[PDB]
Amino acid sequence: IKLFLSTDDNLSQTYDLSIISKYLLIASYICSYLEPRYDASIFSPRYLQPSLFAIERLLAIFQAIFPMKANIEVFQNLSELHTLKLIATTMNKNIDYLSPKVRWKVNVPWEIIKEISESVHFNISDYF
Amino acid sequence: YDEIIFRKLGSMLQTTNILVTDDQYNIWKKR
């Protein structure tokens, strides 16, 4: 029966990530789907494609949500996420992160951000 | 000033406060 109950065209705790990476990916989703108007009020469009944002917003939200300052491990985890392509940029060839023209967006669906929030005991469900 | 710059610069020559200072035994010797 179970052969006929699932397609089994699938090729195969789904993501095992560092805590800093998990909170960075929470804050990036918040940046990508929360309108910029609310950054001064809440902290002090799911079906649509994610909006772009800036690193200045991501660092501030990450600092405001982690249970960290600016040691190199945060930026290392962010670059790891980009290399993992869990976060996307507005370019295709000759990546130039430090150039001011680049912008950032989330490349991860909500179903994974929810599990990450559960694993780090965070309440993204109450910010929307 | 030397200790602060030594610690900020990451030098291993900065005194490490695992042993209490000799000035502390300028006090403790009287005990």
Added chain:
Amino acid sequence: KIYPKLHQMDMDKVSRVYADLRRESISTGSFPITVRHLESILRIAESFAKMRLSEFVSSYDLDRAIKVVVDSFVDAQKVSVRRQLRRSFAIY
């Protein structure tokens, strides 16, 4: 019948918590802690003593009196401020 009275032995337990609560008010949150909160703590402290029909205020009654007023003040804050204050007042 019962009109429970205060003991000055508990003055430290009351004043120190108030100053600690005041310090966190400027630290986080927009609601400033007012003297009327302290006036509310004593009243509910007296009410807790009146429950036991004891003529004097005990330390146990003050702990529950502090718990109720602090919890209401924390729970009325916005979500961003709410989580910060719950960790700062885990003792209370």
Added chain:
Amino acid sequence: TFEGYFDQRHTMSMAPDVTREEFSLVSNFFNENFQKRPRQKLFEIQKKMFPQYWFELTQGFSLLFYGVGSKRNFLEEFAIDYLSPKIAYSQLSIPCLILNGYNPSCNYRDVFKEITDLLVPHVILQIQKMIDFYKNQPLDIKLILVVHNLDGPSIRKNTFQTMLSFLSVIRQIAIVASTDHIYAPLLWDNMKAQNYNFVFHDISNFEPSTVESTFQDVMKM
């Protein structure tokens, strides 16, 4: 804090005009009379840290230099006057390769040509061949690779970073680099940081950055 970020029709012509000579006048006259002596004293104090850097370089660690101010003279002095002569004459002729990353036209092929010519008897494949070659070779250092502005316009690109990161695997190569951007550590992910194996020191010196600004004019304002 984050609250300091969440809570934050005139023209340039309203200011007096500046000529190219006038721009150089201030930069030349002030820097020779302003903070010269205290920075000289700070340099004399900081020179005592060379043995530790030398030891770390012996043990296989790469050195990264960061902080406020220009970082040309410190690296050049360390590489030329202190590091290479000791490498040569305490072991008993070390090429001190200096790369100016702030030049926006530093082709990686040209630097790789020099490295291959100075170390060898699809650049990544050749670097892998070199790594496999020098594993069994004696561990004594041959080349010093001073990479100024490891966040420079020619250097920020992913391919050049990947090319540099594999070089530190070879023990016989000494890598010294400096960065200026605040988000400089963003450039390097797990693999690149692993291969670099940097040891980080704060060399904030308030040396007036003039050579880096020479390549790209400031007179635009």
